[PDB]
Amino acid sequence: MPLTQTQRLINTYGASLKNGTISNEELIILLDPNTFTKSEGYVDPNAPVSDSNHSKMDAIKDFVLTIGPTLDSEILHQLTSRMIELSPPGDRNTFMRGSSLEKAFLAFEMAHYPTKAEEHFNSTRVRTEFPGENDIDNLKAVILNPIIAFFQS
């Protein structure tokens, strides 16, 4: 079973994600950096991911792991593109570094549909935030890679 946090957020948001009808306003709210949280206290790496033991990324991963398999590939692509366009402006040089839903959706698409997901690196937002070849290289090999690897196994 998924985390309780995941279940509640799927209960609220799942239907409007699955058919891609979620409005820009509700998608913006879903993308609020505080929508997903680590468990209170510390994460014990020697214990399984649970309701009382999970990082912020653990929680986001669990949510995507749950909703992702319900998505048509083109619906997933469209959702990921919208999330990249609508993701909140943070401090300089912070886009995709923090644990975020847009990073996880992109990673999930790269894990399962890599040819289609490649188009996201051409987007205005990714180009703005990662303007150089090497910026994109690290985005893929360092920032996205562990999350992609999680979804693949």
Domain ranges in the chain?
2-153
Method used to obtain the model: X-ray
Are 146 and 107 contacting, i.e. CB atoms less than 8 angstroms apart?
no
Distances (CA, A) of 142 to 16, 72, 145, 148: 32, 27, 6, 10
Secondary structure of the chain in the HEC alphabet?
Answer: CCCHHHHHHHHHHHHHHHCCCCCHHHHHHHCCCCCCCCCCCCCCCCCCCECCECCHHHHHHHHHHHHHHHCCHHHHHHHHHHHHHHCCCCCCCCCCCCCCHHHHHHHHHHHHCHHHHHHHHHCHHHHHHCCCHHHHHHHHHHHHHHHHHHHHC
